[PDB]
Design a protein around this ligand. Structure first.
Ligand SMILES: Nc1ncnc2c1ncn2[C@@H]1O[C@H](COP(=O)(O)CP(=O)(O)OP(=O)(O)O)[C@@H](O)[C@H]1O
Ligand SMILES: Nc1nc2ncc(CO)nc2c(=O)[nH]1
Ligand SMILES: [Cl-]
Ligand SMILES: [Cl-]
Ligand SMILES: [Mg+2]
Ligand SMILES: [Mg+2]
Ligand SMILES: [Mg+2]
Length: 158
């Protein structure tokens, strides 16, 4: 299955954090990376009172079940110092969010797929479009269409 994972970091050298995360993602059992987006420098959502993010996206081919992939992404976060979860955000070393998992629609205590807010976030959609320009969402909407019918502005490269 192809999982699309959003990567963000705005603490402790985001470029090192993202490169470390890429290496770790490739080492997840029963998985290998297919594609990696460019790296983008984005202002934080909300409280402007924190550093800029590095944002990226990757496509991961995996035979793991969705929650198994989640367990691994959460362990990579922890190994890279990310401890606060489901709280108001302050600067974080790493955030790995599962944007899409195949064409699956998941609404559990642990996992909401497609990511609940991705269609509102250029920092998720533009890196995804760079690696998957022909992508269609589970509800039949095309990614290209979402990005143009609502005039999302372009991002700056890191
Ligand atoms: N698609 C998904 N990817 C990652 N975590 C998800 C997820 N759907 C639900 N979750 C849940 O989200 C919980 C909180 O994760 P956090 O990383 O703290 C949210 P965040 O990434 O800071 O906000 P965001 O989801 O608005 O980007 C996790 O414990 C996980 O169970
Ligand atoms: N620019 C930017 N802001 C964010 N704000 C909150 C969150 C919550 O995870 N993520 C991000 C992000 O990835 N990029
Ligand atoms: Cl943290
Ligand atoms: Cl959808
Ligand atoms: Mg591997
Ligand atoms: Mg997030
Ligand atoms: Mg997260």
């Amino acid at each position: 299955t192809v999982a699309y994972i959003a990567i963000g970091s705005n603490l402790a050298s985001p470029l090192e954090q993202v490169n470390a995360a890429l290496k770790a993602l490739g080492d997840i059992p029963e998985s290998h990376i297919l594609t990696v987006s460019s790296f983008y420098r984005t202002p934080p959502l909300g409280p402007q009172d924190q550093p800029d993010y590095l944002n990226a996206a990757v496509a991961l081919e995996t035979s793991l079940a969705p929650e198994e992939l989640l367990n691994h992404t959460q362990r990579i976060e922890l190994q890279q110092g990310r401890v606060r979860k489901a709280e108001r955000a302050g600067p974080r070393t790493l955030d790995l969010d599962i944007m899409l998992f195949g064409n699956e629609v998941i609404n559990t205590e642990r996992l909401t797929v497609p990511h609940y807010d991705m269609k509102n976030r250029g920092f998720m959609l533009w890196p995804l479009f760079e690696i998957a320009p022909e992508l269609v969402f589970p509800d039949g909407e095309m990614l290209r269409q979402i990005l143009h019918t609502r005039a999302f502005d372009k991002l700056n490269k890191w």
